[PDB]
Chain A
């Protein structure tokens, strides 16, 4: 957590050393492509989809089944989200904290942290417009915030 902050974090997952396996379990390449697409129909973000398979269907790495990452499977079938997931959550956070700063405007700690989210988005939207996921003409305003999250 080093970006907009004082602090040096180190805390995350570490992938298992062997991508292949495990023979001991029991799962299939074709059956797992159905189950990913199962949840994405009902409106879940790929960050949560892998976690449901981990905690229901004992799927450690989903790659280690299919040979394929989760977002590729959705885009292969042709049914991912339109916005990136990291971008979606920030604009959904930033519209909510701006809703708060209407009501009571004295918390400058709210204002200071409205920037540093609004700042984070303008970094990401640049990155995604290079990869050509969002078209040049796409924008983020206060008026256009609720249109994109919905």
Chain B
């Protein structure tokens, strides 16, 4: 894109903390109400972004007319597929399950999660059902659809988000 990359470098002027931060990539989504932007960060840089963060995110969200959900590059295969490098034994962090669950605790950062579950249907198909802490939002109440779109892009999963 370089909508967010141009937007970040101008607001990064004058700040010691945001001085060395970088963005790899971004994926826009269809959110019914507005759109949402999902901004990937090089892993070691997550807690550098995420230490303060809430200074600049209102300024970035207001300018682009969209919500911003910051995410780590969490990547993870047991069987070689080619075009990828795979550890034989592998590691828990490396595996997909850790990746998909680490992704949530980025996406909805500031509230954190009380409950999580699945609902398996009579047909067979499955619906994840995350529950946000009932204390942080307040704010979380406003952006629920945005996450359901955004999380369905990254992991492929039909979720909902509730109190």
Which residues on B sit within 8 Å (CB–CB) of A18?
112-114
Minimum CB–CB distance from B96 to chain A (whole Å) comes to 19
Minimum CB–CB distance from B71 to chain A (whole Å) comes to 15
Q: Mark B99-143, 1 if CB is under 8 A from A, else 0.
A: 000000100001011110000000000000000000000000000
**CB-based nearest B residue for A19:** B105
Interface size class of B (residues with CB under 8 A): under 10
**CB-based nearest A residue for B105:** A20
Q: Tell me whether chain A's interface is mostly helix, strand or loop, or mixed.
A: loop
Contact check, A23 vs B114: say whether CB atoms are below 8 A apart: no
**CB-based nearest B residue for A21:** B112
> Which of these, B110, B113, B115, contacts A23 with CB under 8 Å?
B110
**CB-based nearest A residue for B110:** A23
Which residues on A sit within 8 Å (CB–CB) of B105?
20
Minimum CB–CB distance from A105 to chain B (whole Å) comes to 53
Q: Mark A8-24, 1 if CB is under 8 A from B, else 0.
A: 00000000011011010
Q: How far is the CA of A18 from the CA of B109 in the complex (A)?
A: 12
Which residues on B sit within 8 Å (CB–CB) of A21?
112
Q: How far is the CA of A139 from the CA of B83 in the complex (A)?
A: 52
Which residues on B sit within 8 Å (CB–CB) of A17?
113-115
Which residues on A sit within 8 Å (CB–CB) of B110?
23
Q: How far is the CA of A51 from the CA of B113 in the complex (A)?
A: 26
**CB-based nearest A residue for B112:** A18
- Which residues between 16 and 53 of chain A lie within 8 Å of chain B, taking CB atoms? 17-18, 20-21, 23
Minimum CB–CB distance from A60 to chain B (whole Å) comes to 14
Which residues on A sit within 8 Å (CB–CB) of B114?
17-18
Minimum CB–CB distance from A30 to chain B (whole Å) comes to 12
- Which residues between 78 and 133 of chain A lie within 8 Å of chain B, taking CB atoms? none
Q: How far is the CA of A21 from the CA of B105 in the complex (A)?
A: 11
Minimum CB–CB distance from A89 to chain B (whole Å) comes to 31
Q: How far is the CA of A2 from the CA of B70 in the complex (A)?
A: 48
Which residues on A sit within 8 Å (CB–CB) of B112?
18, 20-21
Q: How far is the CA of A89 from the CA of B113 in the complex (A)?
A: 39
**CB-based nearest B residue for A67:** B47
- Which residues between 67 and 82 of chain B lie within 8 Å of chain A, taking CB atoms? none
Q: How far is the CA of A18 from the CA of B105 in the complex (A)?
A: 10
Minimum CB–CB distance from A97 to chain B (whole Å) comes to 42
**CB-based nearest A residue for B113:** A18
Chain A contacts to B: CB under 8 angstroms: 17-18, 20-21, 23
What would 6 A/B residue contacts be, using CB atoms closer than 8 Å? A17-B114, A18-B114, A20-B105, A20-B112, A21-B112, A23-B110
Closest 10 pairs between A and B when the two form their complex, measured CB to CB: A18-B112, A21-B112, A20-B105, A20-B112, A18-B113, A17-B114, A23-B110, A18-B114, A17-B113, A17-B115
- Contacts A18-B112, A20-B112, A21-B112 known; 7 new A-B pairs at CB < 8 A: A17-B113, A17-B114, A17-B115, A18-B113, A18-B114, A20-B105, A23-B110
